[PDB]
Write a protein that binds this ligand. Structure first.
Ligand SMILES: *[C@@H]1O[C@H](CO)[C@@H](O)[C@H](O)[C@H]1NC(C)=O
Length: 935
């Protein structure tokens, strides 16, 4: 801490008045600007030298809504904003004069923090020097930059008046930021084509060398097409401090030694500022009837803006409200959003509309394998899996939790929620749904290692499943390999051994327990097993264990060499007995340890269990089967006549194979799964038979759908140094939006028909710097130039009272042909409103021509001829066809009036009425009103 680093005296508080105005727009062309006024009363407490405390009160924000005179009022966000302002005090350290440190409140919101940082950034003032003009590297809210120590005027010894420049394009913290761009998406070139600087002045006092009053202003101009770097899309932000009083030890130390460097905060608006998002969808409802699809691309841009500023909680809460107005537009908006929450949304909608839940589970299973998990998506996939519990859902969740743990080893509460949900699923000892219990065991046998640090009950519950034989034998076994990927604890190993020595235990169960234990072998257990085996009765498990002993003793791997030596030392008293025929005896073929396990009931010889390993735990192949020995004995144990009748009498075949790769159980298939597949094919056949029924809905007609497809081809949005503290983001979006409004409504029996689907294309170059205060206010003006073309025709053919009138409806809305030229819009936090176009020098040219009787092919435009175009001002270029009113529309009418006066009239109804009429008897009339050849 230098002797005279600061120009302030401790034990002398400072009552200052902070102000700021974030004006934005195009100078010269007009004067109406998008500005967000803000002011507050700042209490600077001074515990000691180079130690400060910040308090603030009466932080009132004012919003521009009119001119005569910048009309200002109080926002609905202002009160809670000031509440956050006065919620906490701040601590400031500036040791050594250069090093500056922030001590914030731990719970103080980060945007509030950087707001305060921006406020205090201008508060720094560098001590005087002999040179009136100087340039020094000084830190700001965005790190060290080149300040300009320029004495406005000096009293020789002192200079109360002073000025400083900081060209913001030369700041250390000038780095841009990542943004929630469209997934189908240039930073430094954008920095080049923009301006960023501050230039301002300050007033000290001669009496006490304290800043009397300071004022700062900045410039942020879209350089291309700008006029002498002084006109065009510019953002000028103010920051003014006004002293009011300097009233009258301990300094509050903060644990977080935060730096004055700006912290990136995602631009956002609260539900109060995000209420109109539903109206943001209602707007494209208007083109349902208004059909003026020129602004549809701009509407989609508004959608992009609101979703970027949206909150996950709100959107998740009101997704059905989003989707109700029209599903596919909402879906494509979510796709193009580029925001993580969108990923969660659609499937939540999907199950909400029963849109083939089978493929819903399929796609969720597909997406759960991503290596970039999110907690909210984990919660919702857990919820949906609990909902339907299909194989795909459970496998998806099983892989997703492992992926999340691998990516994020840090534990979270949702993992505990999943764990207790699972232990509820198994209840006490896995007495629930047999196949569901099997599937959830297959699940847990993958991430129980991840959850090992979470709940010790994991083992305690599942051993209850292991010990209790109330569940069926298959689930009984599955309880063991639920622990297969689990590290056996001492209690686990003891329970395993106690269940293991049971002779009434099935041979496969005992062997599986043996394998699970020998995962972590114990010398005493091996000794007792070796001493028991000579009197062992189950021959096939004896062959299996002898094979396993041979595998370990002959394991050439040095990793198993020590274990082989230990087993040889144990078996020195007596070696293992003879090995049986591996062709027809249960034996472990632990062949890089590839293990073959063909185990059967000692009564029979067909291996009920066929396990194959591969090795990390590369691949695991298993299969448990039963009910096939009677099938074999059907002929093995003239015949065909009795066999055909005996087919149904055979015991029900029962098989279930499974595959687990990299620990995670990939999936299993059983004969029950096979008949499930048969039922699924039956459902598919029903769906295929449903199309004859669907043709009724097809012919029901009476519909109109605005198939408009949006896209963003350029997405380069970021954040750059904001002098106003409130973030200066940068939005750049080129948006295309073609599409047609197609719908069916007719009546064949009534002889009714019409034409639909006029297609059109729109373009939006939404580009500026976003002067937006996250959750508080938004200001600025993006470039608004639209390249729109209109095409397609609509007709209407009907028949009534025998009059076959074939109407050619000229639309009430004149049909456009091409649109071009800029039409800008002052964008406010509440609602953007059209920027008024220029008047002088805007040649209001309008070339029209009644090319066809009743219709006018016309075009018009205006632009002033001093920024380069289109920054010069509003530009118009519109070519279209408009009804002249003399003909409201055309219609070809015909009625078989027997006399027969079968009229054939091409009436062009309207103020004028031209028609070719044909009535034949033979009355050969040929009427042409235009040339008036009315034969
Ligand atoms: C000032 O800029 C210099 C350039 O040498 C740099 O070393 C220093 O860290 C900067 N100071 C701050 C406070 O950013």
């Amino acid at each position: 801490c230098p002797k005279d680093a600061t120009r302030f005296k401790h034990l002398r508080k400072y009552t200052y008045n902070y102000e700021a105005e974030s004006s934005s727009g195009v100078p010269g062309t007009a004067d109406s600007r998008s500005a967000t006024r803000i002011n507050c009363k700042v209490e600077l407490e001074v515990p000691q030298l180079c130690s400060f405390i910040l308090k603030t009160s009466q932080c009132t924000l004012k919003e521009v809504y009119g001119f005569n005179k910048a009309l200002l009022k109080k926002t609905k966000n202002s009160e809670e904003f000031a509440a956050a302002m006065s919620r906490y005090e701040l601590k400031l350290a500036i040791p050594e004069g250069k090093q500056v440190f922030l001590y914030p409140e731990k719970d103080e919101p980060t945007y509030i923090l950087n707001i305060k940082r921006g406020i205090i950034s201008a508060l720094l003032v560098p001590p005087e020097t002999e040179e009136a003009k100087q340039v020094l590297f000084l830190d700001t809210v965005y790190g060290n930059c080149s300040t300009h120590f320029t004495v406005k005027t000096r009293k020789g010894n002192v200079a109360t008046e002073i000025s400083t420049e900081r060209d913001l394009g030369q700041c250390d913290r000038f780095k841009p930021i990542r943004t929630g761009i469209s997934p189908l998406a240039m930073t430094r070139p954008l920095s080049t084509l923009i301006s960023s600087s501050q230039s301002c002045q300050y007033t000290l006092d001669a009496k006490r060398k304290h800043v009397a009053e300071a004022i700062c202003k900045e410039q942020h101009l879209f350089l291309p097409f700008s006029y002498k770097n002084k006109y065009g899309m510019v953002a000028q932000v103010t920051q003014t401090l006004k002293l009011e009083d300097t009233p009258k030890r301990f300094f509050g130390e903060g644990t977080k030694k935060m730096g004055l460097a700006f912290e990136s905060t995602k631009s956002t608006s609260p539900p109060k500022q995000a209420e109109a998002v539903l109206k943001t969808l209602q707007e494209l409802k208007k083109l349902t009837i208004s059909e003026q699809n020129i602004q549809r691309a701009n509407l989609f841009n508004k959608l992009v803006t609101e979703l970027r500023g949206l909150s996950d909680e709100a959107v998740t809460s009101l997704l059905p409200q989003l989707i109700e107005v029209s599903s596919p537009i909402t879906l494509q908006a979510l796709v193009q959003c580029g925001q993580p929450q969108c990923s969660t949304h659609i499937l939540q909608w999907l199950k909400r509309v029963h849109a083939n839940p089978l493929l819903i589970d399929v796609v969720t299973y597909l997406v759960a394998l991503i290596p970039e998990p999110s907690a909210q998506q984990l919660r919702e996939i857990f919820n949906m899996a609990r909902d339907q519990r299909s194989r795909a859902t459970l496998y998806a969740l099983s892989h997703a939790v492992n992926n999340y743990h691998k990516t994020n080893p840090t534990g979270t509460q949702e993992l505990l929620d999943i764990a207790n949900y699972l232990m509820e699923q198994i209840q006490d000892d896995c007495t629930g749904d047999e196949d569901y219990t099997y599937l959830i065991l297959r699940v847990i046998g993958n991430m129980g290692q991840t959850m090992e640090q979470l709940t010790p009950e994991l083992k305690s519950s599942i051993l209850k499943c292991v010990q209790s034989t109330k569940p069926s034998l298959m689930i009984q076994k599955a309880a063991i390999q639920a622990l297969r990927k689990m590290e056996p604890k001492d209690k686990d190993q003891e329970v395993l051994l106690q269940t293991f020595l049971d002779d009434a235990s099935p041979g496969d169960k005992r062997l599986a327990a043996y394998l699970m234990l020998m995962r972590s072998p114990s010398q005493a257990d091996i000794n007792k097993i070796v001493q028991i085996l000579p009197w062992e009765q189950n021959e096939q498990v004896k062959n299996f264990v002898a094979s396993h002993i041979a595998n370990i003793l002959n394991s050439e791997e040095l990793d198993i060499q020590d274990l082989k030596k230990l087993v040889k030392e144990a078996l020195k008293e007596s070696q293992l007995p003879t090995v049986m025929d591996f062709r027809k005896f249960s034996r472990n073929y632990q062949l890089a340890k590839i293990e073959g396990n063909l185990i059967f009931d000692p009564n029979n010889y067909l291996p009920k269990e066929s396990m194959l390993k591969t090795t990390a735990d590369l691949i695991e192949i298993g299969l448990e089967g039963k009910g096939f020995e009677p099938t074999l004995e059907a002929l093995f144990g003239l015949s065909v006549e009795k066999l055909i009748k005996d087919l149904k009498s055979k015991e029900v075949p029962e098989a279930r194979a499974y595959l687990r790769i990299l620990g995670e159980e990939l999936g299993f298939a059983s004969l029950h799964d096979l008949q499930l597949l048969g039922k699924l094919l039956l459902m598919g056949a029903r769906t295929l038979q449903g199309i004859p029924q669907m043709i009724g809905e097809v012919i029901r007609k009476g519909s109109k759908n605005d198939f408009f497809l949006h896209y963003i081809f350029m997405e380069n949005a970021f954040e750059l140094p904001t002098g106003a503290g409130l973030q200066l983001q940068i939005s750049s979006s080129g948006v295309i939006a073609p599409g047609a409004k197609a719908g069916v409504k007719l009546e064949v029996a009534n002889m009714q028909a019409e034409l639909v689907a006029k297609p059109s294309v729109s373009v939006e170059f939404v580009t500026n710097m976003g002067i937006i205060i996250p959750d508080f206010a938004r200001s600025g003006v993006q470039m608004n130039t639209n390249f729109f073309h209109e095409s397609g025709l609509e007709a209407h053919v009907a028949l009534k009272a025998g009059k076959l009138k074939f109407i050619i409806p000229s639309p009430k809305r004149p049909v456009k042909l091409l649109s071009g030229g800029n039409t800008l819009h002052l964008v406010s936090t509440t609602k953007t409103e059209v920027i008024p176009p220029l008047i002088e020098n805007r040649q209001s040219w309008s070339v029209c021509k009644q090319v066809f009787p009743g219709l006018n092919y016309c075009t018009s435009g205006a632009y002033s001829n001093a920024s380069y175009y289109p920054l010069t001002g509003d530009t118009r270029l519109e070519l279209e066809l408009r009804p002249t009113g003399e003909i409201e529309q055309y219609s070809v009418s015909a009625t078989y009036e027997l006399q027969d006066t079968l009229k054939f009239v091409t009436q062009a109804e309207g103020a004028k009425q031209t028609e070719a009429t044909m009535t034949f008897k033979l009355s050969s009339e040929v009427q042409i009103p235009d040339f008036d050849v009315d034969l």
